[PDB]
Assembly symmetry: C2
Homo-oligomer: 442 residues x 2
Amino acid sequence: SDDINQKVAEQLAQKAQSSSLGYDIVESLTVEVGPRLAGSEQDKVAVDWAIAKLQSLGFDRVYKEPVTVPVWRRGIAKASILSPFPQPLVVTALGGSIATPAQGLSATIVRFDTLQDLQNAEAGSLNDKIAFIDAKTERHRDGKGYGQTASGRSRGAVAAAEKGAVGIIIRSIGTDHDRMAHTGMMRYEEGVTAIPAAAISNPDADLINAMLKRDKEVVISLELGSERRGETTSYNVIAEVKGSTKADEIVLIGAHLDSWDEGTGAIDDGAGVAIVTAAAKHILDLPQKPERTIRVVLYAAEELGLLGGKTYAKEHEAELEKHYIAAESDFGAGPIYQIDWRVADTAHSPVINAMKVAEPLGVAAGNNKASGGPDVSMLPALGVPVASLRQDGSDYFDYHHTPNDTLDKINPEALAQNVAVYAQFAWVMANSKVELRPLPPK
Amino acid sequence: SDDINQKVAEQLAQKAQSSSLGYDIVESLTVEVGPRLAGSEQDKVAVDWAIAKLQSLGFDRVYKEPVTVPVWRRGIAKASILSPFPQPLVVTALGGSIATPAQGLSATIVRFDTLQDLQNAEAGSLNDKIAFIDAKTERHRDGKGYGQTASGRSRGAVAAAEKGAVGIIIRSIGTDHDRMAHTGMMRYEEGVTAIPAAAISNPDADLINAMLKRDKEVVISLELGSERRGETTSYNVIAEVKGSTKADEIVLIGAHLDSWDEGTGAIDDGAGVAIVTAAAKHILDLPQKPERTIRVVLYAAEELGLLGGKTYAKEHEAELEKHYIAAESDFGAGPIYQIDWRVADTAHSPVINAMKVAEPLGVAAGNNKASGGPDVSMLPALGVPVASLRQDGSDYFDYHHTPNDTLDKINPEALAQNVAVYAQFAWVMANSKVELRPLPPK
Ligand SMILES: [Zn+2]
Ligand SMILES: [Zn+2]
Ligand SMILES: [Zn+2]
Ligand SMILES: [Zn+2]
């Protein structure tokens, strides 16, 4: 009954709070693998680590599924201001950037408040120059500031090249004022000349601004080494807690296994790997079996455009109708404060009620318009219900995509609360009688 | 009278709180010069900046005095763990390190809790190996943690070479857990083979520890580029507020103009330059003249061993008897909470009383055993009284000697409180009738 399962969920939360497992999994990943950019030598290391780890935890099935991934290698990154006042910058290439010319790159910059301002510039206005997008990212619990500025990183190099720019630097898409350059994916556009593209630290962007405010033009030097290889194979890594009376139905709880390459991928998304794996292990430890199968999916190549998520959706196309609900942890280790849903209108109040078991952990009732996390975000359009278990990310963009994304950034008590809430979610959902389909129109 | 001068001191503090001058001076230095390692091209840039700045503020005399300085240039710094689990490290050369061999340097490490533990190792025990000193620096308002661990940086390369080491890495002498490597001076010893010497970030030292805790040996790669040139000339930069009835007597308020090269030297010691310069300017702005001359000294090459301070003490030897008191701001921008003295026994209670004017700014009475700041610390032995105006440095070693020592680390309200307290100090001391000599035995 709902009552019996509420009490199991209460006990799962107790276990999460008394067990070092969640922390131990992320310590293991960050120490024994470290950064694991898709397509790098560390990609296979992370996959092999995850397979061994899941086997060692005793899951009923542990297997992997191939995902095609591109190969990009980061080389040197050096930048400085040449004039008016010569100074060093702390820079990093945007993910996928081409290298700077062998002859080298030195140019006058032109500052834009935002990507939109750059897109509005006159054609030819950046000939021989480097674009500088200065947009600052606001700090928000829900990360909505990142949502407003991230496109500068994703699309700035295209917009700048369209105006004649020979390069782009951006203010890091970060909420810190640390001397850390934030990387992340960017995309060139077929038809537009690819140009070198880098992020500079927030203090460096402040410095450039201080010089511009003196009615001086700023000239920089930028050097980026990088290399592109042909595509290869990574893997979605999967573990299951075997179901019982409804074993053909799947509750999917996910994270991504890949990361950027300059930190150790601790909060993005080693924390999420640990949260969903530990939650599933606590469930595996129960004397009771869930009705549904619980499937942990550790997705490949999320950083490169949800490639593993998209691959999974297609590979499991015939199985999606039997996916009861899907959710993903990929907003660091901050505690969960709300669960939002994407279920049938007639399921919404029932699932809110089911998850009131998490109220004492600080988790509020939510809406019925959830997108789901990145790797499951394509699944509602295919009919699959999802939940967004909302994490407090107020500090997340201080470290996201920097060399500072390290184990010591994880608050163990907060990590444990996520393990507790996912364990409750996966248990309650794997035993729920609520009909979650059909999803109402978006 | 003491009463009239108490009220001027109160008004000076008002000015400091209502004026952006202190902040503006450090903004100017960090933007228009940036990092200014002694002996680098930026050394002359900083001197020329300071001369122009002091002239622009209208000081009665502005001049400079030569200081011999060594020339060391930092090149590349790359390090990684090769085994058991290959990963990147964030490293920086210790100031003055020789370069690593052209053939390259890869070696097994041996961990030591502290410099003392390394010094206790058996001769030959580090043959072919790299020493790793792991001592963590405790956070303290007075910086006493730095005092306990700093010698690992200063003297570790010598102690490691004595035991056969081919190199040394240290846990950065820092209180942060940021991915920032802290540099700073080290000294080789004539007679002992010079070896490459670097600091790694605190998270990287944690990582190495996590591998060692797995009963694995750790092997690293270390690459350091550096170059030593012959000595050259830097300068102590001096400004004066002209005295009146006691113009032959000097109240010296100082800071150092030089910095390490990877940040912008904002808190070490751009803040101190701004504090003492702004304090003197507020005094210069008064309609009243001080009795004594107030001398702002912006010392050269403090980071390389107090070279400008030592030079000043010798150059001004015949003038020291007329130095009434000396003090230096070189503990960032945190507010002052206490003034300690080094005056005659019979002057102690009188100077405490004189400075009770700063109580409302949060400044407590202090002792009579002050060392004085670094550049004036040699002066008591020459008979010159000093004060230590104690700053709250709880956060100072998060940024000291890192690339993160940037303008945005300065709390403007705290910087203003220092300007207020130095203005009071310099005014009260430049008009005091207390006999400060002779100093009692140390
Ligand atoms: Zn992520
Ligand atoms: Zn990411
Ligand atoms: Zn200093
Ligand atoms: Zn220093």
